[PDB]
């Protein structure tokens, strides 16, 4: 797009990852105002309108809140307390033809200052004196649409810095385009709290035996409790099981008869019981009643 015709384009109802922006190693003036660039992918905002121009690299640092200049006065202005990212990188290899890349004209002159976030287009010429121009170009006509000279012999400050503005405004609208959500791997046969794509709960992630039709995402059973789910990256059916729990039965024969105890663990497969009770937290007297030389089922 041009700076006279950077459209306020609506890209909506999709996702755009931003982690691929950092690692490709060509950014020049990648600047995120308001929100941190590290926390851009996980948390988003609404009003994700997008802008684009190949601005010249001499005054990219003039694009700042509370900073005017030439680009911020006659080309494009940030408002104060701006949330969003201005992302500049090198554009020497492709937007630079022989004899000067005269494909992007630019508005050099304007009668007043720009309001921020305004796309400026004009056909008429600048007025500076009292004598009006009669169509034929004269001494005070001052044609604003000059040309950026983008030659391959230009340096890194003279070659264009390709800016894109992922501006984040705040209006009463639903959010459309956000960054990606990071996911961990999946474990099996352990009592784990799980964060799926919409449902969360506590249980044991087990390998399944049934299968679904291709339009169920999850499933429940008698009396409305979730028992099955499918992962969204590999698409395999998975049944869940409730976690280990229950009671400890400890033999006492009465105070006057004896003192020592034996220990029974009801409704538990007792191979994971020092993970179950806090034997590493309690006394060493409690430590010898999570195991022993004799094991009976």
């Amino acid at each position, epitope marked *: 797009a041009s700076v006279y015709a950077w459209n306020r384009k609506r890209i909506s109802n999709c996702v755009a990852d931003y982690s691929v922006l*950092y*690692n490709s*190693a060509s*950014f*020049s*003036t*990648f*600047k*995120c*105002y308001g929100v*941190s*660039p*590290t926390k851009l992918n996980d948390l988003c905002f609404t009003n994700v309108y997008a802008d684009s121009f190949v601005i010249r690299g001499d005054e990219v*640092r003039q694009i700042a809140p509370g900073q005017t200049g030439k680009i911020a006065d006659y080309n494009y202005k940030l408002p104060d307390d701006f949330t969003g*990212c201005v992302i500049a990188w090198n554009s020497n290899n492709l937007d630079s033809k022989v004899g000067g890349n005269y494909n992007y004209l630019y508005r050099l002159f304007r009668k007043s200052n720009l309001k921020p976030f305004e796309r400026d287009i004009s056909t008429e010429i600048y007025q500076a004196g009292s004598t009006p121009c009669n169509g034929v170009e004269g001494f005070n006509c001052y044609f604003p649409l000059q040309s950026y000279g983008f030659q391959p012999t230009n340096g*890194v400050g003279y070659q264009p810095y390709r800016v894109v503005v992922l501006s984040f405004e705040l209006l009463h609208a639903p959010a459309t385009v956000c960054g990606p959500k990071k996911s961990t791997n999946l474990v099996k046969n352990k009592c784990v709290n799980f964060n799926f794509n919409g449902l969360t709960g506590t249980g044991v992630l087990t390998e399944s035996n049934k299968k679904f039709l291709p339009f169920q995402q999850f499933g429940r059973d008698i009396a409305d409790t979730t028992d099955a789910v499918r992962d969204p990256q590999t698409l395999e059916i998975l049944d869940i099981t409730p976690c280990s729990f229950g009671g400890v039965s400890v033999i006492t024969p009465g105070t006057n008869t004896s003192n020592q105890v034996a220990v029974l663990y009801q409704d538990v497969n007792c191979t994971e019981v020092p993970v179950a009770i806090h034997a590493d937290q309690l006394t060493p007297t409690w430590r010898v009643y999570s195991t022993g030389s004799n094991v009976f089922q």
Partner: nanobody, 124 residues
Framework: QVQLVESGGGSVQAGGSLRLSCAAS????????LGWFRQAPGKEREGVAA????????YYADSVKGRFTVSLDNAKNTVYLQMNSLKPEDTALYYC??????????????????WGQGTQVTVS
């Protein structure tokens, strides 16, 4: 909220090597970009070295290209500037800086930085 302590300076002969260090304390996880500044006598403060903490990507100026090396140690939260094959035109005050709003190349003084105290490096 971000504090930098710079050490490792000193005097060296022409063709020697030095290894500066800049130790950070405070909001470590917000730091996204570390740059090395240099203020020559009779010149403005310029940019020399660059390092992105997220990526490990490095950028170097043309006057230090092929001779200067920047390295990051996240265990000690200390960035390093390995300056090998020194010449007496590099006799200047060297400053380490921290950024938290992103990375910008080349370095400019007018942005928001967390400044160090600076050490003296003399090559003769």
């Amino acid at each position: 909220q971000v504090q930098l302590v710079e050490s490792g300076g000193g005097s060296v002969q022409a063709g020697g090597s030095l290894r500066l260090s800049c130790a950070a304390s405070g909001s470590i996880s917000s730091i996204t970009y570390l740059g090395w500044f240099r203020q020559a006598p009779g010149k403005e403060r310029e940019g020399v070295a660059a390092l992105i903490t997220v990526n490990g990507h490095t950028y170097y100026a043309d006057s230090v290209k092929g001779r200067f090396t920047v390295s990051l140690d996240n265990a000690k939260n200390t960035v390093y500037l390995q300056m090998n094959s020194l010449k007496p035109e590099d006799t200047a005050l060297y400053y380490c800086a921290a950024a938290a709003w992103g990375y910008a190349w080349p370095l400019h003084q007018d942005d928001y930085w967390y400044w160090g105290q600076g050490t003296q490096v003399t090559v003769s």
